[PDB]
């Protein structure tokens, strides 16, 4: 009995979307001038780690950065002079995530053990020491992002997310509804909304104060690994394991474009945007990175080679530098100017 | 040069910091790691506790033989699926697998799991060591009646006599010699798909036995030796 009503409601929802397809965005941009070829060069290299590397992050001042390894160590570097500032040991070896605070006073990390911990740096005595630990989860973590000083968000392998308060160290809200493992999440310019995706090949939207979902998408047919936002805040893109990338909108609520080539068989790992939103970058398993045109959907360059798998990417705030990492325990920086 | 007085202090600080990493690496390169797996029916916990002499998610144990340090790990609370987090163990030494030979009705799942683990894309260059357990119940049930294997696994009736190379380490009736049949059903699968990049080692075990630690050492030494020959290019 209830199945028929559900089918009726699904069909009613499907009916509306047909009319909104007023035009195809391919036709309205065929007259735009192309962009052209691009070349870049390497500037600096950083050695030091004894094993493979997983994650990295940038700072607000655009001068400092932090990196992690599965050998149980964290290092902070000075980009201009290539000098090491601090090194901190760990009690656990299996780590996956790290983050940086906006004011530069606090840092957090996590791993297989269901704890995203925090550390302090500024004290009268010279030494780095731990402050607090948060527990309560039943699955391995994926990411824990800062937001403000006294707030933090986290996701876990189990299909639930929660919010925390450092002062009392207890949760305040929980979100549920998924049926598969959750992998990634991203915040918005104005901190009121955020998105996340899971292995169910679907995405959702959430409200922070209220705590209820609003919208969903189902495009892909395979696992989803990466997601990122647009500077305006009304669009986002996703990557999948089936060697495809797609775009979405919030007010129209339908897909726009797809990028693919017949020569590629491997998957994707990371994705990031530029300042003006004209350029898009992504990495692959085959030791190569590619660049794409956001408006014309054509490839325009390559970023040389590496000796092993590539993991992470990042762009600075001022948009003058970009770094890359891989499993070969080495890091590189590119400027690409003439 | 153009450097100021203050920068040289930072240079010296970095130079001093750089040293400890070499000693750390030297200490690091002198340890081995192992991974353990099994099912509820197996006596994994009993073996661990005997060898020793809330939501943690991981457990650790240590032991020393001949002034050599070994590390072992186990997993705790996790969901059923194993697809995603398996990738992290690409560079471990060896794996151990435990099985209950007494029960007959639940034998096919073990074979299915073995076939599943054997051919994964991320483990082409890792070997496996296999243990069998609980022989006393097998012997006691074989001596008595009211049970048979022909009901479950046909083709045992046409099976030959024990192979010519089968030894006789104990004085027992010929009926007790049914372990070789099971040993050949697992080795049959392991036989194929091999091109000299990984190997398998079977063994027998008893209830609450001892001298288990000595066994792993020889295989570990042999496996370590085999790699260097390929490394140089002489093999």
């Amino acid at each position: 009995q209830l199945r028929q009503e559900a089918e009726q409601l699904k069909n009613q929802i499907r009916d509306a979307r047909k009319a909104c397809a007023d035009a195809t965005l391919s036709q309205i941009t065929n007259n735009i001038d192309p962009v052209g070829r691009i070349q870049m060069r390497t500037r600096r290299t950083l050695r030091g780690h004894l094993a493979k590397i997983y994650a990295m992050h940038w700072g607000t001042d655009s001068r400092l950065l932090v990196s992690a390894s599965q050998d149980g160590k964290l290092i902070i570097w000075d980009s201009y002079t290539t000098n090491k500032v601090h090194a901190i040991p760990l009690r656990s070896s299996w780590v996956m995530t790290c983050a940086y605070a906006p004011s530069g006073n606090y840092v957090a990390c996590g791993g297989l053990d269901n704890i995203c911990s925090i550390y302090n740096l500024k004290t009268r005595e010279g030494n780095v020491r731990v402050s607090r630990e948060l527990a309560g989860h039943t699955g391995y973590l994926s990411c824990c992002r800062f937001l403000d000083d006294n707030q933090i968000v986290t996701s876990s392998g189990d299909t639930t997310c929660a919010l925390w308060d450092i002062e009392t160290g207890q949760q305040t809200t929980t979100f549920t509804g998924h049926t598969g493992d959750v992998m990634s999440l991203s915040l918005a310019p104005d901190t009121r909304l955020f998105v996340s995706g899971a292995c169910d090949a679907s995405a959702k939207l959430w409200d922070v104060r209220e705590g209820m979902c609003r919208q969903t998408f189902t495009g892909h047919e395979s696992d989803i690994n990466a997601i990122c936002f647009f500077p305006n805040g009304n669009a986002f893109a996703t990557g999948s394991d089936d060697a495809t990338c797609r775009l979405f909108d919030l007010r129209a609520d339908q897909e726009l474009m797809t990028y693919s080539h017949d020569n590629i068989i491997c998957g994707i790992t990371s994705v990031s945007f530029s300042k003006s939103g004209r350029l898009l970058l992504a990495g692959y398993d085959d030791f190569n990175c590619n660049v794409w045109d956001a408006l014309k959907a054509d490839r325009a360059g390559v970023l040389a080679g590496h000796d092993n798998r590539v993991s992470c990417l990042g762009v600075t705030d001022d948009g003058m530098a970009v770094a890359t990492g891989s499993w070969d325990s080495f890091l590189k920086i590119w400027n690409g100017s003439s | 040069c153009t450097l100021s007085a203050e920068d040289k202090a930072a240079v010296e600080r970095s130079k001093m910091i750089e040293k400890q990493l070499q000693k750390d690496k030297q200490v690091y390169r002198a340890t081995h790691r192992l991974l353990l797996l099994g099912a509820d029916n197996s006596g994994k916990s009993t073996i661990v506790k005997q060898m020793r002499i809330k939501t943690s998610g991981i457990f650790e144990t240590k032991f020393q033989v001949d002034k050599v340090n070994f590390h072992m790990f186990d997993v705790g609370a996790q969901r059923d699926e194993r697809r995603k987090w398996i990738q992290c163990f690409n560079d471990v030494t060896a794996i151990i697998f435990v099985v209950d030979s007494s029960d007959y009705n639940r034998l096919q799942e073990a074979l299915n799991d073995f076939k599943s683990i054997w051919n994964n894309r991320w483990l082409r260059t890792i070997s496996v060591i296999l243990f069998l357990n609980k022989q006393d119940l097998l012997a006691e049930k074989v001596l008595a009646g009211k049970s048979k294997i022909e009901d479950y696994f046909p083709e045992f009736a046409r099976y030959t006599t024990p192979e010519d190379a089968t030894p006789e380490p104990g004085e027992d009736p010929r009926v007790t010699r049914a372990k070789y049949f099971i040993r050949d059903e697992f080795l049959r699968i392991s036989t194929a798909s091999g091109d000299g990049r990984h190997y398998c080692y079977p063994h027998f075990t008893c209830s609450v036995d001892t001298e288990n630690a000595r066994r792993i050492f020889n295989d570990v030494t042999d496996i370590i030796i085999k790699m260097n020959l390929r490394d140089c290019g002489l093999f």
Partner: single-chain antibody
Framework: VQLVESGGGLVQPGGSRKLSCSAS????????MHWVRQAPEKGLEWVAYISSGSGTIYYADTVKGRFTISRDDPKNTLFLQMTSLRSEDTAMYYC??????????????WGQGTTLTVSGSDIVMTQATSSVPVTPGESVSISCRSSKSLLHSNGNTYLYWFLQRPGQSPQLLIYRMSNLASGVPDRFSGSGSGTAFTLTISRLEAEDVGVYYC?????????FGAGTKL
């Protein structure tokens, strides 16, 4: 964080003496040390330095050949040796600490001293004394001059200030000409130019009375000015 020293006494010409210091309450291995002395009715003077790794040592011209310094890490103690004393060595001594890295504050702490009895660039400031009412609206300013350009190609300028009160050790207020210390009130302000610098104070209160000083840190030979009353 406390520091204490011992020594001193009475000697005749052609003698020798030794001094020692003790520390507690912080990681000792990460900091360098310095020495300073003062005259009964004169200014300050710099003596020596030692690095964290015991890799560099430096001395002044006047005491280059006679004085020696040593460090002991396990015992957390410092030593100093003297010989061939003269009649012009009556002074009181002090100790300081320092540390360096991107964004660090070198000088933060000072200690007491012990008494003893025996029987390049120029920096300039004047206006020895001035009158000050106690009304809150009152404001004062001070100036100083140098004989060489302190600006470097990097873009940083090195200048420091200090204040002393009756029967108490000096204190630090501002570093690098534009930065305030952690605990100092926000009333104080400072600015300067290539070869001219100034200080400003507003909303005076009774506790402010004291004497002030300045220092330069470009070339290793360090020189000090003479302070001004208020």
């Amino acid at each position: 964080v406390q520091l204490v020293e011992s020594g001193g006494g009475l000697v005749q010409p052609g003698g020798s003496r030794k001094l020692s210091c003790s520390a507690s309450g912080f990681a000792f291995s990460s900091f360098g040390m310095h020495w300073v002395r003062q005259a009964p009715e004169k200014g300050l003077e710099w003596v020596a330095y030692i690095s964290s790794g015991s890799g560099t040592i430096y001395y002044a011209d006047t005491v280059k050949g006679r004085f020696t310094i040593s460090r002991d890490d396990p015992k957390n103690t410092l030593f100093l040796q003297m010989t061939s004393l003269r009649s012009e060595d009556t002074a009181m001594y002090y100790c300081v600490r320092s540390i360096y890295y991107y964004g660090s504050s070198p000088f933060d702490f000072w200690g007491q001293g012990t008494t003893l009895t025996v029987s390049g660039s120029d920096i300039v400031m004047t206006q020895a004394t001035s009158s000050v009412p106690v009304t809150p609206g009152e404001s004062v300013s001070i100036s100083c001059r140098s004989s060489k350009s302190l600006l470097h190609s990097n873009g940083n300028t090195y200048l420091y200030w200090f204040l002393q009160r009756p029967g108490q050790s000096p204190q630090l207020l501002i570093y690098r000409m534009s930065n305030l210390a952690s605990g100092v009130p926000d009333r104080f302000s400072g600015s300067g130019s290539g070869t001219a610098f100034t200080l400003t104070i507003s909303r005076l209160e009774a506790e402010d009375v004291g004497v002030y000083y300045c220092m330069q840190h470009l070339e290793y030979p360090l020189t000090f000015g003479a302070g001004t009353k208020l």
